[PDB]
């Protein structure tokens, strides 16, 4: 099936639990499509910004899996303000910040913080995270789950 096909099932607000069946399927799909990365970030940005917490949560988990399964071609897309601004809008009180849940917000920050470490190459990711702090959105570096592959 198609990218949206996979994502829709992988982020369905009805799911009783995470369905890693579709999460991985969305990932390999991205790895097949000549424009999988470009298309995927756009799709993910939208799901992550959904008013339905469970949909955004699953979307974030899917985004996390793509970071580990879709290599550099995916990283490059995430490392752009085009996508990053969409995540900022989720935690920034100026935009969607005052409506999104603490669950979604902290998850997003955890990931951004994580990427500044794992992808020292992606300067835009650092600038994005740094702003969030300089703007009081993030009071301090959050603790994160142990993952030794984060270089």
């Amino acid at each position: 099936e198609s990218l949206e096909s996979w994502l829709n099932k992988a982020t369905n607000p009805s799911n009783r639990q995470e369905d890693w069946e579709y999460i991985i399927g969305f990932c390999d799909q991205i790895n097949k499509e000549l424009e999988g990365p470009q298309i995927a970030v756009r799709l993910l940005a939208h799901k992550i910004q959904s008013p339905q917490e469970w949909e955004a949560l699953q979307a974030l988990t899917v985004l996390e899996a793509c970071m580990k399964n879709c290599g550099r071609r995916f990283h490059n897309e995430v490392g752009k303000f085009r996508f990053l601004n969409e995540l900022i809008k989720v935690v920034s009180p100026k935009y969607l910040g005052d409506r999104v849940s603490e669950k979604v917000k902290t998850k997003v920050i955890e990931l951004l913080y994580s990427w500044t470490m794992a992808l020292p190459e992606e300067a835009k990711i650092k600038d994005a995270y740094h702003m969030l702090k300089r703007q009081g959105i993030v009071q301090s570096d959050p603790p994160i789950p142990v993952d030794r592959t984060l270089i």
Binding site: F81, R82, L84, N85, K89, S92, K124, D127, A128
Partner: peptide, 5 residues
């Protein structure tokens, strides 16, 4: 690509 928010 554009600029940061």
């Amino acid at each position: 690509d554009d600029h940061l928010l």
